[PDB]
Amino acid sequence: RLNTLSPAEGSKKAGKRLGRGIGSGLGKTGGRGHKGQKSRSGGGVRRGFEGGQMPLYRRLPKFGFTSRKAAI
RNA sequence: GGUUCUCCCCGAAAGCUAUUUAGGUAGCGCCUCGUGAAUUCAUCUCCGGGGGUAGAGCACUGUUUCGGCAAGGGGGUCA
Numbered sequence: 001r002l003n004t005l006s007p008a009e010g011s012k013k014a015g016k017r018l019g020r021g022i023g024s025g026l027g028k029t030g031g032r033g034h035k036g037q038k039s040r041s042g043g044g045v046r047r048g049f050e051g052g053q054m055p056l057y058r059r060l061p062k063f064g065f066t067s068r069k070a071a072i
Numbered sequence: 073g074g075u076u077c078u079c080c081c082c083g084a085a086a087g088c089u090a091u092u093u094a095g096g097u098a099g100c101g102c103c104u105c106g107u108g109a110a111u112u113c114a115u116c117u118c119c120g121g122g123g124g125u126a127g128a129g130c131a132c133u134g135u136u137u138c139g140g141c142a143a144g145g146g147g148g149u150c151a
Contacts, residue, residue: 019075051097
């Protein structure tokens with residue numbers, strides 16, 4: 001019977017493979033569009049980057065303090 | 073610059089804001105899939121609205137041509 005067990009429907013998806021033909025859908029850059037920083041290998045912006053504008057976590061003021069008694 | 077098998081369904085944008093930013097990027101707008109909702113939404117009819125655009129006009133702010141009345145101004149009679 002070892003060649004009769006099957007998984008539940010919807011348990012597997014087979015993943016996404018990029019750049020494998022036209023009919024496969026996401027080929028020819030595999031869904032990352034045309035030129036640009038995001039299209040490059042290893043490209044992208046770090047967390048909180050807004051394109052040069054002051055990030056939200058920098059526009060706002062830090063407040064409060066940590067209490068050691070709260071951890072005990 | 074290149075990115076390799078197939079079929080089915082839906083289907084954009086080239087805008088705004090910010091950026092040592094302008095051929096990059098972030099949020100929003102636009103696309104897709106899922107979930108939940110109210111005759112929610114669109115077209116038409118009727119009703120209630122506020123505009124100052126087209127047009128027009130010259131009361132006002134400016135500009136413009138002609139004619140009249142013409143304060144006033146010059147020369148001339150004077151006491």
